[PDB]
Amino acid sequence: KPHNVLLFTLYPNAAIIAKIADYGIAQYCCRMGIKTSEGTPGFRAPEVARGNVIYNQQADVYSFGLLLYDILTTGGRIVEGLKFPNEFDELEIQGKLPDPVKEYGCAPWPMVEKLIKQCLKENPQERPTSAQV
Amino acid sequence: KPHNVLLFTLYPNAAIIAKIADYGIAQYCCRMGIKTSEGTPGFRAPEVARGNVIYNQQADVYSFGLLLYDILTTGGRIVEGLKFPNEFDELEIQGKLPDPVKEYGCAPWPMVEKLIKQCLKENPQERPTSAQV
């Protein structure tokens, strides 16, 4: 989520800025996948939302994509999700999300809107791996 | 003065933070000294204040000392100098200045209070050179 990302400095030309915390539901996914479905609604992969699949580490890429969608449009959809958590979760699980530039009115960043269109596909095999992102 | 010093970033672990500007009265002091007395009252050396001496580059060290006195006690005396510019100039020219820790109430910094006691002496020959500071 945009809440487990910790900022250590706001100076752009630093060496360490962002860090990751809150490893409460981190598990082991070697080759066989995972059956338990956990994660905050609205930041879950489509496979994580449903409880009838065995998903792999690549379901964590979708969440990153959502994070990059919130980083891009300054957390625009998180504010609106407070009013409608049901629509929040439904759209996050489904994948029918608005174009980030069109609605929230941000300066175009065409080389990360491509990532946001890549690592949000409903098919986990098509999303880039974490080493490719 | 603490007005010709320009800040380019407030991140301590940078490479360039402070810079010097406003070279309006910068002159040439090879070996023979200078006779003209110029500079903002309250930031001048004792020799600069009087107009009957031939001072050298080391009269610019005193000003630096005053700057380090304002950097230390967060520009304490500059605020009080607005109410009494005459006392401001008189004390700056004379040299009878209060102990920075005692009056303005700052955390002790004993290795820069030594500079403020060194490069504010009434005898220009005793102050450290700019390469020693």
Curated annotation (Swiss-Prot), chains A, B:
Where in the cell? Cytoplasmic vesicle; Perikaryon; Golgi apparatus membrane; Cell projection, Axon
What is known about the tissue distribution of this protein?
Expressed in pyramidal neurons in all cortical laminae of the visual cortex, in neurons of the substantia nigra pars compacta and caudate putamen (at protein level). Expressed in neutrophils (at protein level). Expressed in the brain. Expressed throughout the adult brain, but at a lower level than in heart and liver. Also expressed in placenta, lung, skeletal muscle, kidney and pancreas. In the brain, expressed in the cerebellum, cerebral cortex, medulla, spinal cord occipital pole, frontal lobe, temporal lobe and putamen. Expression is particularly high in brain dopaminoceptive areas.
Tell me what PTMs the record reports for this protein: Ubiquitinated by TRIM1; undergoes 'Lys-48'-linked polyubiquitination leading to proteasomal degradation.
Stated consequence of mutating residue 24 to S:
In PARK8; shows an increase in activity in both autophosphorylation and phosphorylation of a generic substrate; results in increased PRDX3 phosphorylation promoting dysregulation of mitochondrial function and oxidative damage; results in increased APP phosphorylation on 'T-743' promoting neurotoxicity in dopaminergic neurons; shows increased kinase activity in the phosphorylation of RAB10; does not inhibit interaction with RAB29; shows a progressive reduction in neurite length and branching; shows distinctive spheroid-like inclusions within both neuronal processes and at intracellular membranous structures; shows lysosomal swelling and reduced retrograde transport of selective cargo between lysosomes and the Golgi apparatus; shows apoptotic mechanism of cell death; no loss of interaction with SEC16A; significantly suppresses lysosomal enlargement when overexpressed in LRRK2 knockout cells due to increased phosphorylation of Rab proteins
Q: Where does ATP bind?
A: 3, 6, 21-22
List residues binding GTP.
Answer: 103-126
Describe its assembly: Homodimer. Homotetramer; when activated by GTP-bound RAB29. Interacts with PRKN, PRDX3, and TPCN2. Interacts with VPS35. Interacts (via N-terminus) with RAB29; this interaction is direct and stimulates kinase activity. Interacts (via ROC domain) with SEC16A. Interacts with APP; interaction promotes phosphorylation of 'Thr-743' of APP. Interacts with MAPT. Interacts with RAB8A, RAB10, and RAB12. Interacts (via N-terminus) with RAB32.
Domain comment quoted from the record:
The seven-bladed WD repeat region is critical for synaptic vesicle trafficking and mediates interaction with multiple vesicle-associated presynaptic proteins. It also mediates homodimerization and regulates kinase activity. The COR domain mediates homodimerization; it also mediates homotetramerization via interaction with the protein kinase domain.
Disease implication from the record: Parkinson disease 8: A slowly progressive neurodegenerative disorder characterized by bradykinesia, rigidity, resting tremor, postural instability, neuronal loss in the substantia nigra, and the presence of neurofibrillary MAPT (tau)-positive and Lewy bodies in some patients.
Relate the protein's function as given in its record.
Answer: Serine/threonine-protein kinase which phosphorylates a broad range of proteins involved in multiple processes such as neuronal plasticity, innate immunity, autophagy, and vesicle trafficking. Is a key regulator of RAB GTPases by regulating the GTP/GDP exchange and interaction partners of RABs through phosphorylation. Phosphorylates RAB3A, RAB3B, RAB3C, RAB3D, RAB5A, RAB5B, RAB5C, RAB8A, RAB8B, RAB10, RAB12, RAB29, RAB35, and RAB43. Regulates the RAB3IP-catalyzed GDP/GTP exchange for RAB8A through the phosphorylation of 'Thr-72' on RAB8A.
In the record, the note on similarity to other proteins reads:
Belongs to the protein kinase superfamily. TKL Ser/Thr protein kinase family.
Q: What is this protein called?
A: Leucine-rich repeat serine/threonine-protein kinase 2
Upper classification of the organism: Eukaryota, Metazoa, Chordata, Craniata, Vertebrata
Task: Name the gene that codes for it.
Answer: LRRK2
Shown stretch of the complete protein: 1996 to 2128 of 2527
